[PDB]
Write an enzyme that holds these catalytic residues in place. Structure first.
Site, mmCIF file in Angstrom:
data_model
loop_
_atom_site.group_PDB
_atom_site.id
_atom_site.type_symbol
_atom_site.label_atom_id
_atom_site.label_comp_id
_atom_site.label_asym_id
_atom_site.label_seq_id
_atom_site.Cartn_x
_atom_site.Cartn_y
_atom_site.Cartn_z
ATOM 1 N N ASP B 25 0.818 -1.076 -0.037
ATOM 2 C CA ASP B 25 -0.104 0.095 -0.081
ATOM 3 C C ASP B 25 0.652 1.456 -0.021
ATOM 4 O O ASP B 25 1.441 1.611 0.985
ATOM 5 C CB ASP B 25 -0.754 -0.115 1.184
ATOM 6 N N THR B 26 0.952 2.013 -1.023
ATOM 7 C CA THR B 26 1.836 3.024 -1.256
ATOM 8 C C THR B 26 1.040 4.285 -0.639
ATOM 9 O O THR B 26 1.864 5.352 -0.562
ATOM 10 C CB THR B 26 2.085 3.451 -2.771
ATOM 11 N N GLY B 27 -0.134 4.363 -0.289
ATOM 12 C CA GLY B 27 -1.188 5.225 0.431
ATOM 13 C C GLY B 27 -0.854 5.060 2.056
ATOM 14 O O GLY B 27 -1.427 5.748 2.575
#
Ligand SMILES: CCOP(=O)(COc1ccc(C[C@H](NC(=O)O[C@H]2CO[C@H]3OCC[C@H]32)[C@H](O)CN(CC(CC)CC)S(=O)(=O)c2ccc(OC)cc2)cc1)OCC
Lengths: 99, 99
Positions: B25-27
């Site tokens: 999850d880059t967020g």
């Protein structure tokens, strides 16, 4: 480009003619933007995050340019803490994870 | 390897002597894992997203293996609906976004 993750992957987007900053978010199925005025018909929908569900306005087939790459898809508008670009549009611009 | 985003970017992780599935999850600034009884000290924390905040336990210097790539850093444990591998660990395995 190739984007490292030491910082938040924030990029400039263009939607409804307005420029904004958004987070490339591989953990988001959908794209969710903070409150704004968008032209066209919308239907209410519910989406859930880590803290529960929120009410959003769903806009279909919306043009959105992400870091120079065009996409046309679903954009949810509501009380999200940050503009997030989700997988529905990340796929359109050809975004992949690599390690 | 390269991971496309047609589907949720789920991968196998090894933590606390257990195997689990988690989202790349880059967020997510930090790594948040489903409830598990990890040993050692921890400090309370609150993290927020869509829907609000949840209470989590912060464990430091925890070893996680992600697709064979070893990493060591902070792990948050609490009633999250999904296991998410955040940027604090994604950077350590050389993960980038590319389009
Ligand atoms: C499906 C199982 O149950 P649920 O449906 C929800 O499950 C989930 C829950 C969370 C996620 C991951 C989350 N994605 C997400 O919110 O996506 C939305 C939009 O598109 C939908 O797709 C998936 C859900 C919908 C983000 O990637 C990361 N987040 C931050 C981000 C928020 C937008 C930026 C602020 S974070 O998690 O909050 C987080 C905050 C601080 C941290 O470190 C300090 C570490 C993590 C994916 C699926 O219902 C539960 C009632």
């Amino acid at each position: 480009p190739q984007i490292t993750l030491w910082k938040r992957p924030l990029v400039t987007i263009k939607i409804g003619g307005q420029l904004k900053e958004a987070l490339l978010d591989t953990g988001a199925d959908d794209t969710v933007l903070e409150e704004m005025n968008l032209p066209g018909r919308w239907k209410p929908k519910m989406i859930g995050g880590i803290g529960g569900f929120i009410k959003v306005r769903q806009y279909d087939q919306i043009l959105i340019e992400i870091c120079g790459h065009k996409a046309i898809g679903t954009v949810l508008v509501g009380p999200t803490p940050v503009n997030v670009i989700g997988r529905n549009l990340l796929t359109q611009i050809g975004c992949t994870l690599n390690f």
